[PDB]
Nucleic acid binder design. Sequence first.
RNA 1: ACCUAUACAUUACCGCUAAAGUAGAUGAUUUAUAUUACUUGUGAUAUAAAUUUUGAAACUUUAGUGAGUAGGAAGGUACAAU
RNA 2: AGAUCAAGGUUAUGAUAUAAAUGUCCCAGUGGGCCACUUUUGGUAAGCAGAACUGGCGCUGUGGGAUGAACCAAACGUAAU
RNA 3: GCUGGUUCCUUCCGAAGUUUCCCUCAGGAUAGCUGGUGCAUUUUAAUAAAUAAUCUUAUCUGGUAAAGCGAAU
RNA 4: UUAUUAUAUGCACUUGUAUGAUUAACAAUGCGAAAGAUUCAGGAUACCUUCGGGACCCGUCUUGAAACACGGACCAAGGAGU
Lengths: 173, 223, 75, 158, 187
Amino acid sequence: GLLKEYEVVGRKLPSEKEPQTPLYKMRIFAPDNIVAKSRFWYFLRQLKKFKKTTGEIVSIKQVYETSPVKIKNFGIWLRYDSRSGTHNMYREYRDLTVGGAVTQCYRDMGARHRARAHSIQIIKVDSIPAAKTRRVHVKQFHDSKIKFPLVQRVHHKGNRKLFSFRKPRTYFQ
Amino acid sequence: SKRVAESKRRLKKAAVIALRKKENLVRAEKYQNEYIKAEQREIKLRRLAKKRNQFYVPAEAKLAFVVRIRGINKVAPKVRKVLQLFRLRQINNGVFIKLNKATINMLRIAEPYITWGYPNLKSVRELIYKRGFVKHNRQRVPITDNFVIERKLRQAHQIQCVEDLVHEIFTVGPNFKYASNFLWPFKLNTPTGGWRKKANHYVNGGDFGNREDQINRLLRKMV
Amino acid sequence: AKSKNHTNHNQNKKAHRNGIKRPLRKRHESTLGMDVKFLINQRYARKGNLSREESVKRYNERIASQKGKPKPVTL
Amino acid sequence: TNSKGYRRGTRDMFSRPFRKHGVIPLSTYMRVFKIGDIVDIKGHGAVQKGLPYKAYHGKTGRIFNVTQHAVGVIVNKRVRGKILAKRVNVRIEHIHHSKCREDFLRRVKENERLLKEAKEKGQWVSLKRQPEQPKKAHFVKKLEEPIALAPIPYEFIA
Amino acid sequence: GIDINHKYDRKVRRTEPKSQDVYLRLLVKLYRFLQRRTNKKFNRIILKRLFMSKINRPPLSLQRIARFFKAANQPESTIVVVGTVTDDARLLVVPKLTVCALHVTQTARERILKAGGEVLTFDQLALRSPTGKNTLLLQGRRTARTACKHFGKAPGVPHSHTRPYVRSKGRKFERARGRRSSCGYKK
RNA sequence: ACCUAUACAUUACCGCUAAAGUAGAUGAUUUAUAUUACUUGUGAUAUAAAUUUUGAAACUUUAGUGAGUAGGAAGGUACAAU
RNA sequence: AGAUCAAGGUUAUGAUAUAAAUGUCCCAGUGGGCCACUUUUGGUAAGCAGAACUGGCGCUGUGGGAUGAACCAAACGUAAU
RNA sequence: GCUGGUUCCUUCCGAAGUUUCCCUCAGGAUAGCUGGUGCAUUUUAAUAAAUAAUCUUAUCUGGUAAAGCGAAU
RNA sequence: UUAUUAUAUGCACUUGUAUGAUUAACAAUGCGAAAGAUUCAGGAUACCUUCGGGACCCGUCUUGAAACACGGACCAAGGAGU
């Protein structure tokens, strides 16, 4: 999908020896509503006793990050399992939206390390301003004025004629 | 002395058919204003509990819709038995199910052949209007009017109209067991656009198990 | 030779085909092999059941022969 | 290449517990047992006078003939597959009292009595059990320490 | 697709008389009409009993015609018997009674008529009591007969008592080993 | 997005299986109209024309449904004689 | 332990019923099995040997895996969509 | 007690390679599985205040996975 | 009080809509045509021509046969549950 962002809150349903059990919350990136509510329990079966049903999911909501046209560079903290090899990482991407730079992580982490997305865990995601971004492929996209004449298209192959007539001479200068 | 008898029958069968139509109008009017005060209350409760900074949980769902999704062979004799008792014996049959602890542990058992979720009113209506059939001594009678619910269910329950079926199913009433076992299981057809894996869970791949709001959107393309 | 002596495949598919056949729920059951009197006593109380309406009240009047039963509450 | 015979593979059916050896406590002979009562069978390993066989330890059934110091129980034994009704004599310390009726017999009282208090108010009975429903819609305040409280992993480094 | 309807969805019964008898296959034609247009259960159990074999329509002696009738309180209830009413010499004095039957032995027709009451075919019943008011519909025992004495046999259980297929009754005919505790065992 | 089964679905047809209906036809039923009792109004009577058998072992209605060796049961079919 | 009276509310979890219950003919065939998940013993291993469970093949076509007895889908009246 | 064959067509249902015994181990008997044919009938049978088989409840049993040797052996 | 809904349409009369597994109105083409004889549709009947798709040889025993398993060159008569 594209990994929207949620804030999912727990309960430990309130049995009589203790009413009002203490309401923990998470920050979950999942493609959909209901899979966000089951990451929550996989990440509750490590920190609190608390399973379903011994617990509840009190109000979650999908959140809609704050500035969708600022050009912030995210820095995510990560934990992932290899073939033999559960490892911490720390990765950085440039994106307008937070859930766009967690899904930027997955398709990159999954390619570069083979990393199937059930063995990746997000352990922090924050915007990191500048002059803290390490990660050389970010901090070359910093310096205004950035000239960069990569004459770029997809250059749609080829066009509406299969047997075209015109020999498309890319450069056009 | 026959023609005296029949045209008193024929004019008291008219007055009872007339006294159903108005009694099935203002009864469908009452049932419709429930489903407006209901969903507007859950807006009212959230816009209340936000300003009082409390967390408003909604109600846990009763009334699933359960549809056999996958295959009649290679099935084991304890998922073979739950899916008989849920009346789901073909592919793309669906029944209405009241949810408690006692059938949810049965949907757990029959989990890899079932997708389920909790249905919209539009989904409850469109399933008995477009696809909806009826048991007349093991026969599968369609709907064709609402005499055919008035027959078997008005004398021993108080269901007589088609919206009394919808009311006894959306609001999971006391006569729920009578008005799910009335309806022959809904022989839906194959969703246009497709499934996704049929044999990985909905959280991983997409089918079996709880969709839990998206049985509505699946049933759009299935009905 | 030796291929397959003593297996259980197909053995509870058979035993669940003309299925597993709970016994019964019989109102009366055989008293065959019970305590043999016991049963001669109950065969003596079955004959002497003679009062439906008549003597079944009458012996309360015989209880009043000792103005009731104050004493025998002990043994 | 066998079992056969009569007490084989009873190194743990008729083993005694941890430190419950010794003299059988004397209430076991004092219990009253009636005809048609229901009863369990745990073959007591310290009494050899008529143990149940190993195919009946674990199984409950109805008494229907009581004697001087043993009881003739009716235990359902599954054979292939036609469940038989057996007729087993066992002694007393190979028997306990069931509890499976004991809850119901207090449900028969109360449904007689929950209709008895509703005999005067009239309405309404609500006698039969329900399995667990969904709970309701609540709302819960923090009220008490607003959120986060926020568990987030860090689970490897070790 | 559906698993299943197996079997036997084919339910099991007989639905017309196997007798090609032109008299019986006409009383059926009648009693179809007396139970689809008067839904009595009295008339089912005459259409159902016009179908069965001669086992399942067993004879019923003249004394049980009478021994049941004298269980009183219905002194004009005709006795309805879908089968044969034979004659009991062990009854001496026969009460005046009215009889419906498929066949009546003549030594019983000579006695009932002499008493004297009636003997009715089943078309005079229905022209008299179509709904079966004041009738007594009886049947003699279906396992009266001695073919039924041999069903079914494990010697080794304490309850069989079920009659081998010998050729002859005597000693030196299945009376030795496996019946006596001396020879072999007691069964 | 899209392609793809003898699966799913809605329809026609064949069988099976399970139900249900029909037999006063010197009767039933129409259409008109004359008369009519008249209840305002609708029935009953006369006329004229009309439809109304089925090896009831039949006809009509309704629903579900269909793999098969070894194997069993039903209904047909070829041969020749009395 | 029983035989007859007196009182008893709304019948006492859920969901199911392609009908179930029962005789006879214990009538035909069969009494060489192989394959597979997970469990497992002998062997160094074996497309080997032997067991436990479930499902299949045997008896089974069609779709898929170029190919195939068992894999994955799916079980099959003649046709259209 | 072994090899070969065993002649029409449709329609319906549809297996077993297991158990016990046998100078038994390429065979029988024997039960399981199968078909036929009925029959009895239910406010789970014909114009339910009652049965029956996966979950729930309640309650019994168990010594395998795990755990243990700062408990016995 | 603000609205909302239903009931208070008989007598006639339509080529009207519905509902009896809701297909029928308009036109064109062509004459069963006396014998004589065309039009339009259809005919893997049983073949030849042209293409596409599928497609291993039966019987048998067998866990498994197209088998580098056995019988079978072909044809008529005979031929086996009495």
